[PDB]
Amino acid sequence: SGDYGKLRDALEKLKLNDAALTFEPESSTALGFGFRCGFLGLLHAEIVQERLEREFGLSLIATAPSVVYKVRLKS
Amino acid sequence: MVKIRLARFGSKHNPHYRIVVTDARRKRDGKYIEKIGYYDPRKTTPDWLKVDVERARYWLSVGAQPTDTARRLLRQAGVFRQ
Amino acid sequence: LTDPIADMLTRIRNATRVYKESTDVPASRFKEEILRILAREGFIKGYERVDVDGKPYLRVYLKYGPRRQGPDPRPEQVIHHIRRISKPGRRVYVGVKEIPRVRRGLGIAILSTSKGVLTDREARKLGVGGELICEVW
Amino acid sequence: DFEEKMILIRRTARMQAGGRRFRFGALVVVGDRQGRVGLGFGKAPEVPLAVQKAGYYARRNMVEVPLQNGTIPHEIEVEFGASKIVLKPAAPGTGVIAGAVPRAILELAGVTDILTKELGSRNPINIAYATMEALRQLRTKADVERLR
Amino acid sequence: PTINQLVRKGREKVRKKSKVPALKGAPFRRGVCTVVRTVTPKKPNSALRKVAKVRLTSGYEVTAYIPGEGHNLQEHSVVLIRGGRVKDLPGVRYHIVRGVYDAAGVKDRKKSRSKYGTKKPK
Amino acid sequence: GRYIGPVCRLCRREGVKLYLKGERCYSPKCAMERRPYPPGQHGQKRARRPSDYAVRLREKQKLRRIYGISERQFRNLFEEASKKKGVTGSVFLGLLESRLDNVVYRLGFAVSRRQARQLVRHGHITVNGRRVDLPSYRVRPGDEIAVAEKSRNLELIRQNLEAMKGRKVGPWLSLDVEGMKGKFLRLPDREDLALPVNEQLVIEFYSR
Amino acid sequence: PKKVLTGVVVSDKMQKTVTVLVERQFPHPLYGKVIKRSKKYLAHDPEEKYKLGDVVEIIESRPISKRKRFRVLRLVESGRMDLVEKYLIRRQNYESLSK
RNA sequence: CCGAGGGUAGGGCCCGUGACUGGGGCGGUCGUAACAAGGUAGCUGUACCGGAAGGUGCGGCUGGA
RNA sequence: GAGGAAGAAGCCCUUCGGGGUGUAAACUCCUGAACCCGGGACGAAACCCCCGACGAGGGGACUGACGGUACCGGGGUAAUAGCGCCGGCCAACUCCGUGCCAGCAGCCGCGGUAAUACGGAGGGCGCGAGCGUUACCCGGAUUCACUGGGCGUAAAGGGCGUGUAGGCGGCCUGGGGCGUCCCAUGUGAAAGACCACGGCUCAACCGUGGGGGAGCGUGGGAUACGCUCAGGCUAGACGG
RNA sequence: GCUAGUUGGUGGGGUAAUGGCCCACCAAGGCGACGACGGGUAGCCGGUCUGAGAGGAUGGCCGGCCACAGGGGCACUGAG
Ligand code: SF4
Ligand SMILES: [Mg+2]
Ligand SMILES: [Mg+2]
Ligand SMILES: [Mg+2]
Ligand SMILES: [Mg+2]
Ligand SMILES: [Mg+2]
Ligand SMILES: [Mg+2]
Ligand SMILES: [Mg+2]
Ligand SMILES: [Mg+2]
Ligand SMILES: [Mg+2]
Ligand SMILES: [Mg+2]
Ligand SMILES: [Mg+2]
Ligand SMILES: [Mg+2]
Ligand SMILES: [Mg+2]
Ligand SMILES: [Mg+2]
Ligand SMILES: [Mg+2]
Ligand SMILES: [Mg+2]
Ligand SMILES: [Mg+2]
Ligand SMILES: [Mg+2]
Ligand SMILES: [Mg+2]
Ligand SMILES: [Mg+2]
Ligand SMILES: [Mg+2]
Ligand SMILES: [Mg+2]
Ligand SMILES: [Mg+2]
Ligand SMILES: [Mg+2]
Ligand SMILES: [Mg+2]
Ligand SMILES: [Mg+2]
Ligand SMILES: [Mg+2]
Ligand SMILES: [Mg+2]
Ligand SMILES: [Mg+2]
Ligand SMILES: [Mg+2]
Ligand SMILES: [Mg+2]
Ligand SMILES: [Mg+2]
Ligand SMILES: [Mg+2]
Ligand SMILES: [Mg+2]
Ligand SMILES: [Mg+2]
Ligand SMILES: [Mg+2]
Ligand SMILES: [Mg+2]
Ligand SMILES: [Mg+2]
Ligand SMILES: [Mg+2]
Ligand SMILES: [Mg+2]
Ligand SMILES: [Mg+2]
Ligand SMILES: [Mg+2]
Ligand SMILES: [Mg+2]
Ligand SMILES: [Mg+2]
Ligand SMILES: [Mg+2]
Ligand SMILES: [Mg+2]
Ligand SMILES: [Mg+2]
Ligand SMILES: [Mg+2]
Ligand SMILES: [Mg+2]
Ligand SMILES: [Mg+2]
Ligand SMILES: [Mg+2]
Ligand SMILES: [Mg+2]
Ligand SMILES: [Mg+2]
Ligand SMILES: [Mg+2]
Ligand SMILES: [Mg+2]
Ligand SMILES: [Mg+2]
Ligand SMILES: [Mg+2]
Ligand SMILES: [Mg+2]
Ligand SMILES: [Mg+2]
Ligand SMILES: [Mg+2]
Ligand SMILES: [Mg+2]
Ligand SMILES: [Mg+2]
Ligand SMILES: [Mg+2]
């Protein structure tokens, strides 16, 4: 669907734990109710979802991961 | 039964009782049957005890039963002086 | 004709503002009782029983005031103000404590009581009350 | 030589081709504080012209106002169109309990302790006039008594 | 209406509608930021006006305002809201209270600091 | 608590000497007589027409200031007068005057309203022999007010009283000089006092 | 006292009992004018004696049945069908008030 | 016998929601119905018609000469 | 707290003369919150004991959580001030920054390069161990109008009759006394409110006393008006 | 628009005691626009806040009554 409310809490508890949950809510046409997380290092992110899916059976796919840019549009 | 007792008023660290007829079972500062005098135990004024002897004796008369401190006061207002 | 007492008070009030000397009002005992107080109290000269076209009326004689100076010289009225206070649509009884002191005493309040139609001050004196009829000043 | 106390200065507008045009309205009360007031409402091109003008008219229009001990002698309600003023006598400790216009009349009429309430349309200009011809209808026990 | 009409049909007492239902109906409410943008106001006011959608403990999801010059708010910032409407911004029933929870006071504000939650100067 | 702060500035803002500060008030170097215009930058600039409410405001403030009293205590008294039988402007003025801190000043045990408070506070006054250090104390008629022992012999109270020989304290009191007692006699008449204040506008003020 | 009411018998059709109507006048709490008001009391009549139409007095009594706690004290009029009709009228009028 | 309650079935009112679909309020395209006889006096109940305002019939009103 | 300059510095304004913060500070003096030291409560006088009788009456003794507290006596240090506002309503104005941005806002509305309306500073007003904000109630709102509003054109007369309930109802006399008015009486607890007095240093608080009133039970009286019954009338209405 | 223990009767049962309080028979009644029935909300007063007053709004502390003791039902003991 899938479980936007059930996902968000999962962030909330982890989010209490840590930085790299690390959520500003986001939405894209690939799937509903998708959110952005940045993880200090690649490994945290890989632990956190993994934890999610084995533990809670919220089996999902996460796009990623993002590097941040110094764009200075000519205008 | 029905009794004669000190019902407490006044304020904190400033008592002023209202010696009162009241059924045993009421909370002390609750509806009594009849006020029959007061008793400031600290004595901060001329009048500091004032039984209504007439009524005191009627009540007493028909089997109301004073406390100890309430009996002790009634004395000082002559309730039992024969 | 639902309220002959209003009707009289009205006849009167209407009359005065045009400055008439008299006006006939159909006669009833009760009405004479009001007219009694009204003249005794000075709001009218007085009244008399009479007759028009056969049937009994009541001719009420009208006080006013001296002429005035300036433009618009019409005299002060002695009856300035007169309204009912106990319409049939709404009966108003008042107890002795409650008898209205009208206009600071500059005016009166009639009122049927069981000791008779008195003024407020009479009703206060005898120490009674009842149906507040009207008020004048 | 009385006191006076402007109660309303206001601007207003005409309209000629290629421009609005102005005029001024001053509504001054004038009184000796002893028991004589007089309200005047004058209008002119410039403000103080319109205030002096108001003065003149004012004096040309004074009023009785009986004073049974600093209060008025009997409660009264008059109502110059849509606006209703209600006066009401009071004890000496009271003070003038009044709207800001009808107080400027009462103040200068020498009134000291009274109650008012403005009901109806609360336009100053009206409430002022309503007030003037509401004082004007006061009478003393005597004033009456002679009338009957 | 005649007195009989009054006896018969009474006078109808008034009743009032809350402008502040999300507070439900506490003096303040806590919530979590879902969106945090700027909004343009209606005419004749022009500005880039700071605003936050909020999900209140009361259940409702409402949009509130960020008074003061600059704010450390962003999504998931948990903040409390007080009643208070912005005239320019349609639909902003509430105000976000500075200096509480995830909301920093306006830094370096010297005046009216109890509004805008700024602690007193050294 | 009390005001504490420049008291002169007041008398400019209010526009008259509310005698508030001891001997100086009667100098040629008192603030008023030097520079009788409001404190601050615009102190000298032309006055605007004072608003109706503005008038009533200063008046309320002129009075209160004179007795250096908290606007809470003030209004409380003012309400007492209304509920009291009598002329409210008046009874206000007297309920105000029965203040122990005041009565000390009126007797001239202290030079000033302000000072009176400190005397009363450090229990230098006593009412009816018993000591009192509340400056709010409501002096009844026939209260005997006096310095008591360990301060009768004090550099100050002597000085003020030394200086109290050939002046007559006001009509509603009395003063056993150098014995150092006085008697509240009766509550004053509005016209014994002659403060520059119009008790009526105050009444008017607490109306709006 | 106990309590004395006066009013029209406005039905039997029960055994030992009469529905009695009872008027009361009083002023409007706020609007002052006088209003009348009414209430039926089921009354006791062991001797199915009191017929319709009657104006009777009934008195506070000890419970005789659920909702029947007055006896009839004494007859004081008779044949007041005019009243009874005014009730049967207000009862009849009701089918026009439905939907 | 009754009986808390559990279960079966059929209704009633409410709330939430739903592909889609009406309209409503707030921020370029087509015309130009109303406001001056507004360029066909307007409004109006009603009917039919028309992209859109609206036009037209029947009767009414002046709040139109 | 009293004194203390035609008036320090600093900072603000300026027509570069000067103004302002300001008797404010400094500073001279005396008073002494806090602290230290000493003594130290009322609330507790009964049950008990003695005389007398295990009665009245009289006498005597035990008992304090609060608390080594309040309070008293002595000694004694100048010892926290903050917050809201300053276009109008509404008491309180200047400069600088910003340039329809940033921001302010309850409402008018402010801000597009001289802003008393934004941000800061000086100055000012308010109140002060508080001062503001939000929420909610009454108020202003005679803006549900009993007191105390309205419907030609502002919202508002039913399209028109007929008539059921209900509302209301002319002139005179008499009986009733339901309404209505009056008197007595019972009730209307205490606490609260109000008036007076007294008790804690005042007050808050508390004690004591006083008056309240609607209401409702009972008894007694009144008869104008409203009701009800009875008689009578012809000015309303109907009919020939 | 509502009502079959529903409304009255009789005779029983029960209680400290009146009553369809419960049970059997008997009659067809009882209630409602003076708002029944359904729905919403709420513990009620002394009081309290406001208000010139009428009024409005409110029932925290305290005093009085009521009701409940995790959600329901039942009785036992007993003066209760
Ligand atoms: S009177 Fe005393 S206080 Fe008031 S200004 Fe003159 S000097 Fe300063
Ligand atoms: Mg004259
Ligand atoms: Mg009018
Ligand atoms: Mg713009
Ligand atoms: Mg624009
Ligand atoms: Mg600040
Ligand atoms: Mg007031
Ligand atoms: Mg039976
Ligand atoms: Mg079952
Ligand atoms: Mg079941
Ligand atoms: Mg089960
Ligand atoms: Mg839907
Ligand atoms: Mg649906
Ligand atoms: Mg056109
Ligand atoms: Mg056209
Ligand atoms: Mg046309
Ligand atoms: Mg055309
Ligand atoms: Mg047509
Ligand atoms: Mg087409
Ligand atoms: Mg066509
Ligand atoms: Mg046509
Ligand atoms: Mg100089
Ligand atoms: Mg300098
Ligand atoms: Mg300097
Ligand atoms: Mg200088
Ligand atoms: Mg000093
Ligand atoms: Mg210093
Ligand atoms: Mg010690
Ligand atoms: Mg002791
Ligand atoms: Mg302020
Ligand atoms: Mg101002
Ligand atoms: Mg500001
Ligand atoms: Mg600028
Ligand atoms: Mg402002
Ligand atoms: Mg500014
Ligand atoms: Mg304080
Ligand atoms: Mg309001
Ligand atoms: Mg007001
Ligand atoms: Mg109102
Ligand atoms: Mg009002
Ligand atoms: Mg309205
Ligand atoms: Mg009305
Ligand atoms: Mg209106
Ligand atoms: Mg018509
Ligand atoms: Mg229609
Ligand atoms: Mg129709
Ligand atoms: Mg008809
Ligand atoms: Mg009829
Ligand atoms: Mg009738
Ligand atoms: Mg009649
Ligand atoms: Mg009677
Ligand atoms: Mg009581
Ligand atoms: Mg008392
Ligand atoms: Mg007849
Ligand atoms: Mg059966
Ligand atoms: Mg059958
Ligand atoms: Mg009924
Ligand atoms: Mg509940
Ligand atoms: Mg509550
Ligand atoms: Mg309670
Ligand atoms: Mg249980
Ligand atoms: Mg259980
Ligand atoms: Mg249970
Ligand atoms: Mg037992």
Tab-separated table of C-alpha atoms (C1' of nucleotides) in Angstrom, chain C residues 96-97 126-128, chain I residues 181-185 214 217-221:
chain	number	residue	atom	x	y	z
C	96	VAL	CA	-45.925	47.336	48.553
C	97	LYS	CA	-42.161	47.118	48.556
C	126	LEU	CA	-51.832	52.661	53.671
C	127	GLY	CA	-49.190	49.987	53.009
C	128	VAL	CA	-50.702	47.893	50.218
I	181	C	C1'	-52.607	42.956	47.800
I	182	C	C1'	-51.766	43.009	53.326
I	183	C	C1'	-50.693	40.654	58.592
I	184	A	C1'	-49.119	36.767	61.508
I	185	U	C1'	-46.703	32.267	61.525
I	214	A	C1'	-37.445	35.319	46.613
I	217	G	C1'	-46.746	25.154	53.894
I	218	U	C1'	-50.620	27.030	57.586
I	219	G	C1'	-54.048	30.721	59.834
I	220	G	C1'	-56.264	35.841	59.465
I	221	G	C1'	-57.905	40.197	56.753
